[PDB]
Curated annotation (Swiss-Prot), chain A:
GO molecular function: GTP binding; hydrolase activity; metal ion binding; structural constituent of cytoskeleton
Entry protein name: Tubulin alpha chain
Record key words, sorted: Acetylation, Cytoplasm, Cytoskeleton, GTP-binding, Hydrolase, Magnesium, Metal-binding, Microtubule, Nucleotide-binding
Residues binding Mg(2+): E62
Taxonomic path: Eukaryota, Sar, Alveolata, Apicomplexa, Conoidasida
Record function comment: Tubulin is the major constituent of microtubules, a cylinder consisting of laterally associated linear protofilaments composed of alpha- and beta-tubulin heterodimers. Microtubules grow by the addition of GTP-tubulin dimers to the microtubule end, where a stabilizing cap forms. Below the cap, tubulin dimers are in GDP-bound state, owing to GTPase activity of alpha-tubulin.
GO CC annotation terms, alphabetical: cytoplasm; microtubule
Active site: E245
PANTHER family to which the protein is assigned, alphabetical: TUBULIN
Gene Ontology BP terms: microtubule-based process
Domain of life, source organism: Eukaryota
Compartment(s): Cytoplasm, Cytoskeleton
Description of how the protein assembles with itself and partners: Dimer of alpha and beta chains. A typical microtubule is a hollow water-filled tube with an outer diameter of 25 nm and an inner diameter of 15 nM. Alpha-beta heterodimers associate head-to-tail to form protofilaments running lengthwise along the microtubule wall with the beta-tubulin subunit facing the microtubule plus end conferring a structural polarity. Microtubules usually have 13 protofilaments but different protofilament numbers can be found in some organisms and specialized cells.
Amino acid sequence: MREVISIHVGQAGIQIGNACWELFCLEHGIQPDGQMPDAFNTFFSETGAGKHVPRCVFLDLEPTVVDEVRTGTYRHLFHPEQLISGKEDAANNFARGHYTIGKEIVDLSLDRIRKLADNCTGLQGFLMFNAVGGGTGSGLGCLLLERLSVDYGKKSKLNFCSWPSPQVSTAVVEPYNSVLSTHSLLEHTDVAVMLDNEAIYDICRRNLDIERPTYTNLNRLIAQVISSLTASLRFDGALNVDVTEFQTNLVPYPRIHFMLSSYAPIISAEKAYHEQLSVAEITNSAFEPASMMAKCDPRHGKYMACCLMYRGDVVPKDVNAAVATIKTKRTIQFVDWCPTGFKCGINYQPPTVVPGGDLAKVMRAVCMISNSTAIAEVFSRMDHKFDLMYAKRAFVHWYVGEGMEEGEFSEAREDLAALEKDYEEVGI
Amino acid sequence: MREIVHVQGGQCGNQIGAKFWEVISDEHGIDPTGTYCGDSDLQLERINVFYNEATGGRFVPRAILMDLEPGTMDSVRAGPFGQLFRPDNFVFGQTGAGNNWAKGHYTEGAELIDSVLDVVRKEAEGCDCLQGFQITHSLGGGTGSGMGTLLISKVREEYPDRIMETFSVFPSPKVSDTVVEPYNATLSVHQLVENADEVQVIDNEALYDICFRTLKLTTPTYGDLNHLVSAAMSGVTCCLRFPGQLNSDLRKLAVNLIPFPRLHFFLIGFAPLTSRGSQQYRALSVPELTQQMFDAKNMMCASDPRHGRYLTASAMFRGRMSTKEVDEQMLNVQNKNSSYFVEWIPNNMKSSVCDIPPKGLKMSVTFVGNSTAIQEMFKRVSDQFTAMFRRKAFLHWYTGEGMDEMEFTEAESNMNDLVSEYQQYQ
Amino acid sequence: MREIVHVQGGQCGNQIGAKFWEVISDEHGIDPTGTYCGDSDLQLERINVFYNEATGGRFVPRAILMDLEPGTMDSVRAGPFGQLFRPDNFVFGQTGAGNNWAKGHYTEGAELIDSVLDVVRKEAEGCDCLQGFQITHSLGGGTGSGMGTLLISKVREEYPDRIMETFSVFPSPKVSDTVVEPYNATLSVHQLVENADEVQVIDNEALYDICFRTLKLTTPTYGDLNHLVSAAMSGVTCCLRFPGQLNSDLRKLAVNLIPFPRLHFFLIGFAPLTSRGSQQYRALSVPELTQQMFDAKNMMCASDPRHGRYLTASAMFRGRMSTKEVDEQMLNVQNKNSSYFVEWIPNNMKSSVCDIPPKGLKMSVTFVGNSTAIQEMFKRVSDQFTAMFRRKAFLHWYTGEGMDEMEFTEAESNMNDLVSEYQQYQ
């Protein structure tokens, strides 16, 4: 009917997808076996006697993280050939993900995607989840998106990049992988949403009061953002929003599609005790500049287009009252050529809480996805890192011996330089 | 007799139209299952204006429900008074115009317009001679503003001399959804100034103002806002369905409001509108109706009427009421607030009296006025349009999808000419 | 017919005005639940002067309640006769003018006057034809003297020809609270002499004398003090509400007792006033009433009238009573006290007899006087003002809210000439 196809590439994609599919199963009330005891058709298919299989593919070059899904609780939820694993790791190399080992699994991946997409017309789009800091997430991510652009041309392609942090790295060669990925996802994606790890680290320190969080706590918060994004496809609402709606409403120029996301409220079970979660204050905390999910303070940018997804016990008059206060607040800055800069979407179904998680049951929530010119600094910062390391050719011999040519560094750098000049020209 | 064919387009149009059929069924005494109850001749004698006999004695609306996204049509069917509509009159789409006027009008609107136009012709040719068409849609969206205005163009080519009334909601002034509002609005107006006979403007923000300060309703949902618009929709067409002392149909309203064919944009008002607490305090009389109807605080357009002059205005009264106070109060409002009416028209006001009030009230009035204070709305859309167009912002979604750069310049030129024609009379 | 709109400002005004809605309520026989009890036509014939029908049979006061703190508004609704008022006639402030005339008139009152003038226009224009407005406030306070005097200026701009009868309670002669008394008094008076038609002054020191020496109460509360002032405030407008041998209105009193437009400050008195023990002992006659009426110890103004001359004076008698003894005693007092009257207006006295006395008496009188002994107040406030202005004490809050030094000099000059023009005719 209308459905969306999720692609998870890399270890980051898979572990985010594990949390994402746990939330989707619990909100529609299907058990890990796959059968519940037709609005939800957008994420699950039908296999005979009442039983539902997800519309996703898991892709990884190591066997490790995909075999651990295969032996977990969700053995029979996923189709056995939706979880594709290769033999050897890409090993933090962009060149390995495209030219050496990437070609052997992309053909098998496209066969699965074609079989899963030709059940219906009215395919809404694709969701990609990947890390640009890695080898297989960045390298094979590009190769799949080049292949998808050739076959499925006009379909909407949303990307969720787990972007490298300014301070915390967990890799040394990630400035190389990130600049090469951004060059090649610029001409392949429609909308790219920037997620940073240390942004969610600081959110969970102050809001959830978790001093020592893990990746499993991060991925729950990411899953709540995706749930709020695609809530309108699944549930009935007062003002619904599609997947194809974002590209008409958020991206003003073809190259400018890099955004910043936020979710509010993120409140603990003890913390909910004392607080009225009013529509006015959950929208104030969404725009509160410290509470971004990308570690870019939006005081040093201008907002260009902004999309608010209300979910829950939300009356439309309090949305209009709350967004008017934001516009009149003079520390929030808008670009001159975009006088009206809001899309509001309101859904009825409240956010579902995972048992034994860290979030509390809340009656209403906001997910905000905005385009701003503050993303200029997150591209300048890797560009400072990239020049400092490429100037005397560190780590280059791993890439050039692996199957790509010296010069793709130079081409990717000038493409990023072109993107930086584009953000500067749009602001003035 | 005479018939109105109803066409309901977009998510906004479908849920405004779903509650329209709730109020008209209630006033004609139709059970949601389609039967009649109420045992009165006056309800039933003129029912073919909105309904069709179905040889099982049930009445089916002459409504065509049209959308590109199958979500909102499921919602209308599942709700109360949802089993009333004919299932063949639903025309689904699969893809959805993502707030893009291009895909509403040109590319995805084209493959569905053949399907909807077949159904409209089946209903239109079915009667002796129909009176006209009424469309409820939105101009800030894609499928209401794009495909709804395409339908207006096609039906005016086929049936040129029939009346065409449009209940259209506009972008709100202050805070406003769907960031490409001025692209959608400006492109839809120039396709609607040439092809619609009377256009009646609604804002959501004006309706929120009404429900806060007059109705004193604490949590107004879109059910309550649509109920207010449906009240005004029934008041324009009272005289077709019920007898009265002075009848006025839609063409009577058209000949009496619009001096020049280019200017046909109307402000809509309804009275009385009182809170539950203040219902029992008020003297519900013709002088009170006329005071409440001439407020900026009561108009369902976000355009302050005292900043302009009323070119021509009309008041459709309902109930058992005395006609001299219908006449003398309309004289009273012209004389005392003399600065707000234009000079080269003597006796600007039109009155019609119908004998059947809405259910639960004793007397009501609906106001349709051609004001030149609607210049303020077209200037607000036009300067927002010129803000974005100079920088070529969000243009590649439109220009890449099968229109040209020149249609935007034509749209701005046609709407700036509409601004200029209003300015010469004030 | 004729209606008086009653408009209340400040904590003092609202506690004084709560007792007006007690003493008028029981004289017209209105139940605090809204209904009427007392089965007599004469109370009910002329009730639109202070009340409005509410189509439930209940009577709602024509009262406008305005304050900048909700604290005294909580007191009004909680007490007896507190359910009578319409809640929409209540208008609140949240911040409170902290005894600053500047923020009562300029800063805090600016955002609230738009709301309260809306409520007054709903009541004023809502009737057939209005007579006048009456105001209760203070001069010593911020929210009574600032926002109440701004309302007088704003409503005079809309309704120039209607009467204004105002109770302002003055700063105390001997000991006064609220250290900015002369800044609130002098700043209010120069706008009150240009915008008020009649002002009759009340002093708290005067009421302390009355309740001690005449009423012989050991513990006079402000419940009891406001009850005494409210008794006289019924008496000046009584003859509008009940028929009589010789009728009088406020405009009857206005044309007669103000000889020149600048001097319209009045003294009030009341008789009879005897203690609880001496109700059974005193012989209630018109000769004894006129002896109590021409006494400084009956006056509700803390002045000695024997130090000056009564320019013009008036006595509104109430009760079924013989008119000769009304007329001959007024002649008797003018012949005996030759030097206490002015010479070049012969027969200075006005009498009016209304036939229905207040409840619990058989005969009563309410006394107004335009005296030139009111120079004691204006000189006493002016030299307290002049002393505190010479070295610029407390000016920086009033300069802080957007005044100048020049408005203070004008305020002194406008009131200093008022002192001289009383002295000119003494």
